[PDB]
A paper describes a structure:
Outer mitochondrial membrane (OMM) fusion is catalyzed by the dynamin-like GTPase called mitofusin (MFN). We generated a modified human [name] construct with deletions of residues 1–21 and 401–705 (MFN2IM). MFN2IM contains a G domain and a helical domain 1 (HD1). In this study, we address these issues by presenting crystal structures of truncated human [name] in different stages of the GTP turnover cycle. These structures explain how [name] uses a primate-only single amino acid variance and a tighter G interface, as compared with human MFN1, to allow for enduring GTPase (G) domain association even after GTP hydrolysis, a feature that is unique in the dynamin superfamily and ensures efficient membrane tethering.
Residue numbers in the entry: 24 to 400, 706 to 756
The structure:
């Protein structure tokens, strides 16, 4: 978790999935015990049909939740005016040209990059549900054009091999968006694609300023989400090297504008945190440097202007703050409610087990007093009637002991869930 913060999410996901398997086993064991106890015709009922059916229903519910928990992931979504550099930023983070991001190109739809354990990339168009190959980035871009049905509300998933990008292997999904100016029905974008985003990145043009259409979208994000994690990349900052008489003053103005936006307008970060959310970068520099590095050549070959390493460190600082943020936030956001659910379900089963225990114990006490009163009713058959009473007392004592043991197992699950909560669900 010190090496790559995203392993925090990977490890949390493994742990809570494993707890849910143990919970399923426990509920299964309990259901079998209840069902056998309900069927016992040698005793007055110590359980009800409602308890049997409730516990079976909890098993069904827990197996459904396991299916959801297995698919949970971190999601970062990128927004900004066309040609600010969104696709280049994504490609830079993935160390490769995954999404089309060249000159003369515009992406008209949402693109969603997700890892696959497969050996080849491929495309999945949502809604239409067809699968196409994407062995090169020109082949992908060819596929987005020949699909005339794609519009600003469409989404195509790019399933990219895991072995290439640790980000993707560690359960991160990256979402690219059409230019922010393409529509004003931006409510639709948030409904469809953003409510499960753990981090939002505004990729702005550092050559100009934050556009009002860009800020307006993040006003709406703040309306829909509680303290959303918002980063601002002032991209294309290599251009500033061309205007050195302005660069430091322009940086100061941009920084104050962006800080005012996040702190005083949205109120989603404090002023002392703003330096960890706003960065001045050249995504094209980073991408080309990493492509060179990946192929075994100096990273300096990616430089577009004087000051390459300064801008590179700024992008690496962004990535570090990003991974620290998304891993901690997504673990809490994506697992807290199922953790609470698992505690409620375990408690309901514990309650049922304790009720069986009490009912058996009470019936056992009744038999023990019946046994002691036999001596006043029977002398010749006293020992046989006592021995028959003893058999029923032993069956009830066995039920009470087993029920008590299963009740106690619920406490083991609740303690595992509390330790998960302590390690992974504390607020920041
Ligand atoms: N000089 C410079 N060019 C960039 C930078 N980032 C992207 N570009 C170029 O700007 C054009 C648009 O970039 P792209 O990532 O496709 O923009 P998008 O529409 O926001 O996704 C492409 O030709 C990129 O290579 C940058 O930091 N500096």
């Amino acid at each position: 978790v010190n090496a790559s913060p995203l392993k925090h999410f990977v490890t949390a996901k493994k742990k809570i999935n494993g707890i849910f398997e143990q919970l399923g086993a426990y509920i299964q064991e309990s259901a079998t015990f209840l069902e056998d106890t309900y069927r016992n015709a040698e005793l007055d009922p110590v359980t009800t049909e409602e308890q049997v059916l409730d516990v079976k229903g909890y098993l069904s519910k827990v197996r459904g939740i396991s299916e959801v928990l297995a698919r949970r992931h971190m999601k970062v979504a990128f927004f900004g005016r066309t040609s600010n550099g969104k696709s280049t930023v994504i490609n830079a983070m993935l160390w490769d040209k995954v999404l089309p991001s060249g000159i003369g190109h515009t992406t008209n739809c949402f693109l969603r990059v997700e890892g696959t354990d497969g050996h080849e990339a491929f495309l999945l168009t949502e809604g239409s549900e067809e699968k196409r190959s994407a062995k090169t980035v020109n082949q992908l871009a060819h596929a987005l054009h020949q699909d005339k049905q794609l519009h600003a509300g469409s989404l195509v998933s790019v399933m990219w091999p895991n072995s290439k990008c640790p980000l993707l292997k560690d359960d991160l999904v990256l979402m690219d968006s059409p230019g922010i100016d393409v529509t004003t029905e931006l409510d639709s974008w948030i409904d469809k694609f953003c409510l499960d985003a753990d981090v939002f990145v505004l990729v702005a043009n550092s050559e100009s300023t934050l556009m009002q259409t860009e800020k307006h979208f993040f006003h709406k994000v703040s309306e829909r989400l509680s303290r959303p994690n918002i980063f601002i990349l002032n991209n294309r900052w290599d251009a500033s090297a061309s205007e050195p008489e302005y660069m430091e003053e322009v940086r100061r103005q941009h920084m104050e504008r962006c800080t005012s936006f996040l702190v005083d307008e949205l109120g989603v970060v404090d002023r002392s945190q703003a330096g960890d959310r706003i960065f001045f970068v050249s995504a094209k520099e980073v991408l080309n440097a990493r492509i060179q590095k990946a192929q075994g050549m100096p990273e300096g070959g990616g430089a577009l202007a004087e000051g390459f390493q300064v801008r590179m460190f700024e992008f690496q600082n962004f990535e570090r703050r990003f991974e620290e943020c998304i891993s901690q936030s997504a673990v809490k956001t994506k697992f807290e409610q199922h953790t609470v659910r698992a505690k409620q379900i375990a408690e309901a089963v514990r309650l049922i087990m304790d009720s069986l225990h009490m009912a058996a114990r009470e019936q056992q006490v009744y038999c023990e007093e019946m046994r002691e009163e036999r001596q006043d009713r029977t002398r010749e058959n006293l020992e046989q009637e006592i021995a028959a009473m003893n058999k029923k007392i032993e069956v009830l004592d066995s039920l009470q002991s087993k029920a008590k043991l299963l009740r106690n197992k619920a406490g083991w699950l609740d303690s595992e869930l509390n330790m998960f909560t302590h390690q992974y669900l504390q607020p920041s």
